[PDB]
Amino acid sequence: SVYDAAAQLTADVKKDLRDSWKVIGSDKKGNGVALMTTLFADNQETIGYFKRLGDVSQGMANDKLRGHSITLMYALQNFIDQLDNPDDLVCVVERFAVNHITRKISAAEFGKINGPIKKVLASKNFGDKYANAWAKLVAVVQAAL
Amino acid sequence: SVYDAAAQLTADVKKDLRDSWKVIGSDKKGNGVALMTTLFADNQETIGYFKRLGDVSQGMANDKLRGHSITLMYALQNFIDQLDNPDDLVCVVERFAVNHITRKISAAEFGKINGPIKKVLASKNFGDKYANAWAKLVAVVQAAL
Numbered sequence: 001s002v003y004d005a006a007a008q009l010t011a012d013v014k015k016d017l018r019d020s021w022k023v024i025g026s027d028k029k030g031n032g033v034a035l036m037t038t039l040f041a042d043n044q045e046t047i048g049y050f051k052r053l054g055d056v057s058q059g060m061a062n063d064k065l066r067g068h069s070i071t072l073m074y075a076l077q078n079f080i081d082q083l084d085n086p087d088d089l090v091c092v093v094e095r096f097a098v099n100h101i102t103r104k105i106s107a108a109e110f111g112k113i114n115g116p117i118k119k120v121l122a123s124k125n126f127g128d129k130y131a132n133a134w135a136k137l138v139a140v141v142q143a144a145l
Numbered sequence: 146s147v148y149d150a151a152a153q154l155t156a157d158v159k160k161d162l163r164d165s166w167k168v169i170g171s172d173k174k175g176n177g178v179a180l181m182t183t184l185f186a187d188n189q190e191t192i193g194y195f196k197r198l199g200d201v202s203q204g205m206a207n208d209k210l211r212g213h214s215i216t217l218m219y220a221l222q223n224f225i226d227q228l229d230n231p232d233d234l235v236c237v238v239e240r241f242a243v244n245h246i247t248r249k250i251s252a253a254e255f256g257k258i259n260g261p262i263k264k265v266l267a268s269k270n271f272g273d274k275y276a277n278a279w280a281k282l283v284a285v286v287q288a289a290l
């Protein structure tokens with residue numbers, strides 16, 4: 001249950017999420033694109049899912065990829081802001097899931113985002129403790145896929 | 146031309162958008178639902194598009210509608226944040242348009258949101274000047290549909 005997954009977000013976990021987000025979320029365009037480019041670099045098999053974005057090897061220059069990356073970051077902004085109210089977190093996550101389910105993105109495939117997140121966090125000096133916190137947020141979405 | 150539409154967002158317009166957003170964007174759940182329920186009240190012919198959300202007449206009590214409403218507000222948050230850079234505003238508007246286009250939403254359809262926005266702003270003591278500012282932002286989206 002998505003609700004059961006949201007239970008893993010204890011006070012300490014929510015604290016690390018907000019603290020780290022104040023930094024990585026402060027530069028959505030730069031960090032969002034870093035996330036996507038890292039995803040494609042370490043998981044080439046996922047490139048096929050994003051054919052609508054054109055040539056993703058163009059990075060920042062690709063306007064479609066840039067728009068997707070910035071938008072992706074606002075979905076994370078949404079999750080972070082609903083952390084204190086499980087009911088709101090759950091309804092936003094379930095809607096979010098709808099389109100990813102239609103695209104046939106399994107819970108395991110979605111989990112591939114953990115790698116890129118860990119690296120982006122590391123680039124800002126946020127270690128394993130923070131990566132584990134983020135993996136728990138991602139697990140909430142996985143519970144809905 | 147989406148670019149020409151975005152060029153209509155002058156200094157005064159951007160300032161008015163930010164000032165009003167400071168208030169309405171502070172309660173995304175409340176004002177998001179208000180915007181959707183006003184839309185369904187003023188333009189019943191649009192309800193058919195949200196069939197997946199169940200009984201939208203339930204407003205806040207409808208989990209799916211609440212989830213959609215909160216998420217809608219983050220798209221607006223996204224647009225407001227890109228006001229400093231037209232290139233970034235345009236690229237996010239174009240990705241946003243993609244799903245609405247797939248849903249066959251035309252520019253004539255999308256413009257119906259101007260009424261509800263004007264009413265929500267008014268409920269928060271924001272008059273004509275602000276309603277006109279937001280109409281210009283909506284115009285950017287319409288130009289991409």
Ligand code: HEM
Pocket residue numbers: 046049050051052053071072073075076099100103105109110111112113243244
């Ligand atoms: C932190 C995790 C992620 C977030 C916050 C995120 C967010 C989003 C958002 C906001 C959209 C745009 C709205 C829509 O659904 O149409 C989207 C689209 C999409 N996402 Fe995710 N996503 C994430 C991870 C992934 C992963 C891991 C995959 C697959 C490997 C994936 C595949 C897709 C695809 C195929 C689209 C459609 C792009 C297009 O062709 O327009 N997403 N995602």
Ligand code: HEM
Pocket residue numbers: 095098099191194195197198213216217218220221244245248250254255256257258
């Ligand atoms: C300021 C105006 C609006 C904003 C900011 C907005 C925002 C959004 C967002 C963020 C989504 C979720 C992501 C996606 O699936 O693309 C969405 C979905 C949707 N929008 Fe829009 N939208 C607006 C107006 C409208 C209007 C006027 C219509 C129709 C007349 C419309 C119809 C839809 C539909 C059918 C969905 C899918 C809902 C669901 O099944 O969960 N939108 N919109």
